[PDB]
């Protein structure tokens, strides 16, 4: 009786375009089984009208089950560019963005995923997402548990964010640090750690979101996975780590990564070394309890070996050198320090890194580290042996020349890092000698006339130094050195004054 | 005592790949973490 029974599209689209819900219900689940079939799929693609009552149907309806079915539809045509294309003319990226605040699983996955095919082959999504808002609505779902779907989410909000310091400040805004950061602290699906930490490279490098990162315990997250099996996750964190160290100098709880960093200068990955050595130079800047834990897990001599691995490689030698700098003053082992640098054999590497080809910034680095360790007197002759007198002269004598930036340091830091080093070195009998030798009175008394305070301040403390010798003394005076401390007693600073006084009362 | 501890700016090293280098694709790895999750 009944027959007929077994332009299939076009009658499909008329349905879900029908006034009646309870027929555009049914017409959805017809056409999400028809999009699971490569043929019915082109048919489907191929018609404007089709796509576009799909992609509304999806928003405005208030059924699941449709709901499901229709962005269940646009995710299979998601797997084509002529599918991809169809979404993104038919408004798809706006309808798809919505269904990201769908209290529904499968929609949210349907969505995220054909918005993450969409951001990846079509011309223009970017773009769109960020219109649409999709930026906001992603950072607000990574409190969501499912890890592959996280690891979609933030994989979205990495092609989203590279580059583009808008959309960066945008999830800067939404919180995304501190969500990207729990993440990090919480799972352990590789995929996942490794597409957050592109996200958090990414944003590493803004201004705005290195400060809220650090705050959330984006450092210490980060260490946690220096020592996963994954490659790209360690080097990923590394240079994360790097990027955001100026601004975690202040953070407590770093021990465990301050361990591992020190450990990851033995790399034979130069490129990990290189990392290391800057993370552990920022990290250890005007912080007493980092510097005591590097000191403590033997970061001396694994500093002192990157030294001597890294030859002319500055890139290398500045970090490791400054990071040795900040290990050799202010702090409880400080002392220690100092002798660990001469006991582990590199006096002779660091006074050689005074000489070209180093570059002015490892050069002032350089002479700070050795003011450090002549703090120490068993380096005092060691340091002699090795030349490093007369290269401190030459230095101060050049920069001097200069200040009556160069190569993007000041030449009166210089001077004051140079004298400094001197007024320290001067403590040793002998080294007053080498120093006096040099004909280097003149110009220390030259250097009481500079407007930088720091700097008559070494330098009437080298010239007190070598005041304590009767012969110095008289060369000190002779040079007219007398009016100009006299006048120095009446110095707001204290060191000057003293110093002063201390060197009128040997002229005398 | 001592020489001033100073901090290093990683600026340039930072910004380098997203000036002169396109993104990295990650499909290969979430290919089939999509098709799963699905």
Redesign the interface.
Known sequence: AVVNLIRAIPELTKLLNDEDQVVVNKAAVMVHQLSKKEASRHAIMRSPQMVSAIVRTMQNTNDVETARCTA?TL?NLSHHREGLLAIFKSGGIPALVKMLGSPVDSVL??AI?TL??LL?HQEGAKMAVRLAGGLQKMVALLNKT?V??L??TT?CL??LA??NQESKLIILASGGPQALVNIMRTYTYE?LL??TS?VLK?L??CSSNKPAIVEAGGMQALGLHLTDPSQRLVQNCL?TL??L??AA?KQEGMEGLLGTLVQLLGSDDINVVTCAA?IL??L???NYKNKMMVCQVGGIEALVRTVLRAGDREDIT??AI?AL??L???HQE?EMAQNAVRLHYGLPVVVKLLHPPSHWPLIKAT???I??LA?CPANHAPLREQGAIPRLVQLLVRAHQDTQFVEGVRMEEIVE?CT?ALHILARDVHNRIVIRGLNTIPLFVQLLYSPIENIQRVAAGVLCELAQDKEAAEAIEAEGATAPLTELLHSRNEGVATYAAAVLFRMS | ???????????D???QE??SSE?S???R??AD??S???
């Open positions: 269940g995710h996955f349907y995923t993450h095919n990846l499912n592959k779907f690891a979609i994989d990495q092609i590279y580059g995929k490794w597409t592109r990414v590493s490098v240079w790097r990027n160290s100026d100098t800057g130079s920022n250890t800047c005007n500045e970090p400054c700098r900040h050799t003053s202010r400080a002479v700070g580290l003011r450090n703090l890092g400094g | 005592l001592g020489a001033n501890d100073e901090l290093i700016s990683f600026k090293e930072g910004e997203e000036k993104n694709s990650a499909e790895d979430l973490v999509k799963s999750l699905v």
